[model samples]
Target: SMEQVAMELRLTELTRLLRSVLDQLQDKDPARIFAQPVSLKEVPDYLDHIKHPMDFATMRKRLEAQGYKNLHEFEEDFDLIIDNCMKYNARDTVFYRAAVRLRDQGGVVLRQARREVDSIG
Candidate 1:
């Protein structure tokens, strides 16, 4: 019974850890491009290129609603948002380059998150 209770307690810690990952990523985005959804009018072909669009606001909202049971879900959303930018924009464009940088820093953020969450024991 005690072990079961501890297992239940660990869930909340996991949620906070995942949320911190997003918070850091948002801060790392200097231009705030990923802060909200992209304008469809600005990029007419956006939906055509990005089949499934994702952004920080939606990711944050989803996290609060779903509260991922595993780290896999969090990583998936993080990857989606960054990859969406890279996919929709040309390699020479600022959006694409921003995604590249975000991807790099994101790896470091996730590494720290993993190490921090390892304290679960």
Candidate 2:
């Protein structure tokens, strides 16, 4: 019961962090602001699989077409969506935050998630 409550509390904190952080970060200029993209280089085994490589130019064009000036803003939009998704599940805090960070950092989580699944193979 205690762990459950603690887990719930952690989820609450995580949700709050995501909501506040992204809400603030979203307003910033996407191209001008920068965050290090999450990398999968740390795990060589996982890097062997999952071949959904993204073309940076195509990614930028896609975001710009959707009203974002750059990939960063696209990431903000995605983070907002993912944050909303995670608000409904206590177990999804990690993923929610990961997505938030990636969107902010241009697909960092997407990359890691890719690597994670690749490693699982």
Instruction: For candidate 1, report its TM-score.
Output: 0.84
lDDT of 1 by residue, 4-86 (tens): 88776677678777788889988878899898888888878778788888899988888786468778788888899888887
Top TM-score model: 1
lDDT of 2 by residue, 1-121 (tens): 9998876665554444334333444334243222332245853543344233222343344433433332344445455444543443355565445445545554444455335333632
The alpha-carbon lDDT assigned to residue 26 of candidate 1 equals 85
Query: What C-alpha lDDT does candidate 2 achieve relative to the native structure?
Result: 0.42
Worst 10 residues of 2 by lDDT: 29-38
Tell me, by lDDT, which candidate is best.
1
Which RMSD values do the candidates have, in order?
2.3, 18.3
- Whole-model Cα lDDT per candidate? 0.83, 0.42
- Each model's TM-score? 0.84, 0.27
Which pairs clash in the backbone of model 1?
none
